[PDB]
C-alpha cells in the first residue's frame, strides 16, 4: 500500500498529525540485482477518520487530498474550527500501568492514543447475523459503552477479544 485506502464514507475526523510524504522506496528489488534513495519531501497532514457504518476497528488514516476531494464540506468545517498548524494532543497513570500488557500496547499505539476508548472496541453482545450466498457470516455487534443505534456489522473472520465466546452465546440462546 503505497497510499491510503478509502474504506467508505468518512463520518468523523478523530485527530490529525504531520507526516512524511508518500515515498517509492517501498517497491521490491528484483532477485537478480546487486549492491536507490530519494530526497525527503515536505511533510503533509494525515487524518485519522471513522468511517460511516463501521466500528472503530476500521479507523484508518487518510490524506488531506482525499478529504479535500471527497468530504469538502465537512473538511471545510473542520479546518475553520481547528488549528491547522499545530495538531491536537483517572485517565492518565492507568494508561501507564495497563500498558505493560503487549496486546494493549499494540492497540494503544494503533487506536487508543488517537481518541478511541478501549471499551468502544469491546463486544457487549451480538444482536443478529447475516449470511452471504457464499456462506460467510456477519454479526451485528453492540459495542461496550456505545448505544444500540451505534451497533455495527463485523465479518465472522475478524479477531476481537472473545469474539468466538460471544458467537457461541448468540447461537446457544437463539432457539430457547
Curated annotation (Swiss-Prot):
Q: Which residues carry this modification: Phosphoserine?
A: 23
Report TM segments.
Answer: none
Q: Which residues carry this modification: Phosphothreonine?
A: 25
Tissue specificity note: Widely expressed.
Q: Where is this region: Disordered?
A: 18-41, 82-102
User: For this UniProt entry, which residues form the secretion signal?
Assistant: none
Which part of the chain holds the cross-link Glycyl lysine isopeptide (Lys-Gly) (interchain with G-Cter in SUMO2)? 117
Subcellular location, in the record's words?
A: Nucleus; Cytoplasm, Cytoskeleton, Microtubule organizing center, Centrosome
Please note every region of biased composition (Pro residues): 21-30
Where is the Chromo domain positioned along the sequence? Answer: 7-93, 121-176
Protein family: Belongs to the SNF2/RAD54 helicase family.
Q: What's noted about domains in the record?
A: The KIKL motif recognizes and binds the NET domain of BRD3.
**Associated disorder, per UniProt?**
Sifrim-Hitz-Weiss syndrome: An autosomal dominant syndrome characterized by intellectual disability, variable congenital defects affecting cardiac, skeletal, and urogenital systems. Short stature, macrocephaly, hearing impairment, and facial dysmorphism are present in some patients.
Biological function: ATP-dependent chromatin-remodeling factor that binds and distorts nucleosomal DNA. Acts as a component of the histone deacetylase NuRD complex which participates in the remodeling of chromatin. Localizes to acetylated damaged chromatin in a ZMYND8-dependent manner, to promote transcriptional repression and double-strand break repair by homologous recombination. Involved in neurogenesis.
Q: What else is known?
A: One of the main antigens reacting with anti-MI-2 positive sera of dermatomyositis.
Assembly behavior = Component of the nucleosome remodeling and deacetylase (NuRD) repressor complex, composed of core proteins MTA1, MTA2, MTA3, RBBP4, RBBP7, HDAC1, HDAC2, MBD2, MBD3, and peripherally associated proteins CDK2AP1, CDK2AP2, GATAD2A, GATAD2B, CHD3, CHD4 and CHD5. The exact stoichiometry of the NuRD complex is unknown, and some subunits such as MBD2 and MBD3, GATAD2A and GATAD2B, and CHD3, CHD4 and CHD5 define mutually exclusive NuRD complexes. Interacts with IKFZ1; the interaction is direct and when in part of the NuRD complex. Part of a complex containing ATR and HDAC2.
Give the protein's recorded name: Chromodomain-helicase-DNA-binding protein 4
Taxonomic path: Eukaryota, Metazoa, Chordata, Craniata, Vertebrata
The full protein's residues present here are 499 to 677 of 1912
Amino acid at each position: 500500500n503505497l497510499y491510503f485506502q478509502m474504506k467508505g464514507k468518512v463520518q468523523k475526523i478523530l485527530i490529525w498529525k504531520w507526516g512524511q510524504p508518500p515515498s517509492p522506496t517501498p517497491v521490491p528489488r528484483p532477485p537478480d540485482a546487486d549492491p536507490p534513495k530519494p530526497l525527503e519531501g515536505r511533510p503533509e497532514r494525515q487524518f485519522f477518520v471513522k468511517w460511516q457504518g463501521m466500528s472503530y476497528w476500521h479507523c484508518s488514516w487518510v490524506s488531506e487530498l482525499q478529504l479535500e476531494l471527497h468530504c469538502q464540506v465537512m473538511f471545510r468545517n473542520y479546518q475553520r474550527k481547528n488549528d491547522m498548524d499545530e495538531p491536537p494532543s483517572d485517565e492518565e497513570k492507568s494508561r501507564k500501568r495497563k500498558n505493560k500488557d503487549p496486546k494493549f500496547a499494540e492497540m494503544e499505539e494503533r487506536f487508543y492514543r488517537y481518541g478511541i476508548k478501549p471499551e468502544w472496541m469491546m463486544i457487549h453482545r451480538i444482536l443478529n447475523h447475516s449470511v452471504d450466498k457464499k456462506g460467510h457470516v456477519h454479526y451485528l455487534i453492540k459495542w461496550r459503552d456505545l448505544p444500540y443505534d451505534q451497533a455495527s456489522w463485523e465479518s465472522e473472520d475478524v479477531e476481537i477479544q472473545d469474539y468466538d465466546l460471544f458467537k457461541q452465546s448468540y447461537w446457544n440462546h437463539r432457539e430457547l
